[PDB]
Amino acid sequence: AFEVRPLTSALGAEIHGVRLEDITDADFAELRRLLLKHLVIFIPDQEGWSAESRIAFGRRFGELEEHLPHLDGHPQIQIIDSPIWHTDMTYAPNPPIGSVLQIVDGPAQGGDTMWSNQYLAYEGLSAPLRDLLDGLTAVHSIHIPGLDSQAEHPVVRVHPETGRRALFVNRAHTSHIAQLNRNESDALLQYLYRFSTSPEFTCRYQWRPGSVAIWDNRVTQHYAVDDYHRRGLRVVVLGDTPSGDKPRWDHYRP
Amino acid sequence: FEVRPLTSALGAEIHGVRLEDITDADFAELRRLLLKHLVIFIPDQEGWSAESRIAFGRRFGELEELPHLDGHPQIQIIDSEPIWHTDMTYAPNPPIGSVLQIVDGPAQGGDTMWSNQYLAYEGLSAPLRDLLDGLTAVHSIHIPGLDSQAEHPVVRVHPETGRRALFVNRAHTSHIAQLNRNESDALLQYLYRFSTSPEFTCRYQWRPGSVAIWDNRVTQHYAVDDYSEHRRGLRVVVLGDTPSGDKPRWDHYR
Numbered sequence: 001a002f003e004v005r006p007l008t009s010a011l012g013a014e015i016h017g018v019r020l021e022d023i024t025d026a027d028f029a030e031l032r033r034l035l036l037k038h039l040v041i042f043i044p045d046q047e048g049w050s051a052e053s054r055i056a057f058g059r060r061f062g063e064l065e066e067h068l069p070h071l072d073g074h075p076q077i078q079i080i081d082s083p084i085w086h087t088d089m090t091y092a093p094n095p096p097i098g099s100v101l102q103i104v105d106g107p108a109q110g111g112d113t114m115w116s117n118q119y120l121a122y123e124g125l126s127a128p129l130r131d132l133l134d135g136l137t138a139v140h141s142i143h144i145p146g147l148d149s150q151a152e153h154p155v156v157r158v159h160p161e162t163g164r165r166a167l168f169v170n171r172a173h174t175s176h177i178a179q180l181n182r183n184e185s186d187a188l189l190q191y192l193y194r195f196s197t198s199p200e201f202t203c204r205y206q207w208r209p210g211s212v213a214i215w216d217n218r219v220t221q222h223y224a225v226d227d228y229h230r231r232g233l234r235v236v237v238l239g240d241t242p243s244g245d246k247p248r249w250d251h252y253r254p
Numbered sequence: 255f256e257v258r259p260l261t262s263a264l265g266a267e268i269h270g271v272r273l274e275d276i277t278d279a280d281f282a283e284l285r286r287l288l289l290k291h292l293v294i295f296i297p298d299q300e301g302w303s304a305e306s307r308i309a310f311g312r313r314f315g316e317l318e319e320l321p322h323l324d325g326h327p328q329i330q331i332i333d334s335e336p337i338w339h340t341d342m343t344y345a346p347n348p349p350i351g352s353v354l355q356i357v358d359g360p361a362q363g364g365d366t367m368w369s370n371q372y373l374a375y376e377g378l379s380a381p382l383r384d385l386l387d388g389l390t391a392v393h394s395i396h397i398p399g400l401d402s403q404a405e406h407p408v409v410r411v412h413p414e415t416g417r418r419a420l421f422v423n424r425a426h427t428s429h430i431a432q433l434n435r436n437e438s439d440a441l442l443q444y445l446y447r448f449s450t451s452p453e454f455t456c457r458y459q460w461r462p463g464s465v466a467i468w469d470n471r472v473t474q475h476y477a478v479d480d481y482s483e484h485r486r487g488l489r490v491v492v493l494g495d496t497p498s499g500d501k502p503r504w505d506h507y508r
């Protein structure tokens with residue numbers, strides 16, 4: 001078994017002795033299990049990871065997103081270049097399952113990424129509040145010049161592979177709770193965003209060249225710190241369907 | 255009687271009344287108006303006798319007996335020597351109502367506002383009402399010479415109307431027992447702000463001789479602090495309330 005060095009009690013772990021290039025299905029299974037346990041894993045010293053290897057590794061988890069700048073003749077490998085808590089693309093009915101990011105160059109310090117644990121954010125709530133959120137759904141939307149999209153998702157979702165409940169609201173894309181009036185929804189979401197990202201549920205990763213970060217976009221939010229040029233390669237695994245309880249109330253009608 | 259309501263929410267001014275020698279039949283109508291309007295205002299009751307006042311108040315229940323009129327501890331004196339509150343909710347048996355007459359004061363300033371706790375509750379969406387029905391709160395007071403506390407349902411049923419009404423107020427409610435203190439604070443903040451919106455309140459302007467009778471079971475009152483003129487008033491406090499509601503749906507937080 002690999003050597004694991006966790007970041008925080010909540011989530012994140014650095015995995016050592018991994019060579020993603022010609023990795024075996026057996027070693028990959030151990031990584032899928034560590035991802036489920038730790039929610040976000042960091043594999044350092046992966047400089048020189050080939051395009052074909054990056055593809056097949058992402059392809060192990062599911063379907064990749066294809067285009068946004070990409071490596072020549074590899075639209076599944078995105079080019080990240082150059083500050084709010086968010087869960088990737090939740091304004092869509094089927095948000096991504098997870099992502100694989102590799103910082104290929106940059107400064108030794110500055111540009112840290114933080115991740116939060118939505119299992120603990122849900123568990124941390126008291127029982128009357130956890131019951132209330134189980135029967136609620138929220139609309140997630142984005143309205144920029146080249147995109148007007150939205151999607152309803154339960155406030156509390158179950159991880160399909162863990163069977164554990166997680167909060168499914170994020171400051172960036174969550175618009176409003178459907179079954180509550182806009183005012184009640186504002187007040188409740190304001191508390192939930194503050195709560196869900198309290199230090200106890202997060203981890204902060206300092207990037208090093210060659211570092212790979214693979215995370216679960218079902219049970220985490222992430223935040224890129226604006227404390228500092230940086231380039232990275234990102235593969236996006238799609239296929240999420242945030243499922244939860246049947247809402248116990250009709251949509252709020254004004 | 256001539257009845258002139260202040261707002262759609264609560265409050266009505268009654269004309270053509272003489273409290274001094276009121277009949278049981280006219281009082282039956284006042285009692286009906288108090289249950290319909292929550293706070294009623296009776297003007298031109300100057301020189302109302304002390305024994306008549308005590309016989310009138312005794313029609314609702316037992317009177318409280320400190321500054322009082324000579325030979326009458328049942329009649330408290332308020333000689334003015336700024337927060338939404340329901341009277342003595344920190345006690346296990348808060349009062350059901352009060353009868354206050356303004357003997358002498360300025361023409362403007364010192365207006366008192368009242369709010370409808372029935373509307374405060376109804377105005378919440380279905381999921382919020384469900385939550386509050388199964389919750390209770392500790393109401394406390396901590397000053398030199400008076401250290402009392404009591405737990406009351408967040409939503410209570412008025413024993414005469416059968417109607418549910420919110421039972422939390424900024425001045426005396428400390429926290430909701432079944433939630434942690436942070437969730438409790440956040441929820442109460444929305445609640446105090448909401449329960450007192452203009453739509454649920456009324457503002458009465460006092461004139462020497464005006465009498466206000468109110469239902470402390472389903473109202474909050476506020477004393478506007480905007481005048482430097484001395485104002486004397488005479489209060490008769492009716493005791494006997496036991497705020498009842500639904501048994502908590504969860505245990506107290508740990």
Ligand SMILES: [Fe+2]
Nearest residue numbers: 086087088222
């Ligand atoms: Fe992202």
Ligand SMILES: [Fe+2]
Nearest residue numbers: 339340341475
């Ligand atoms: Fe008062």
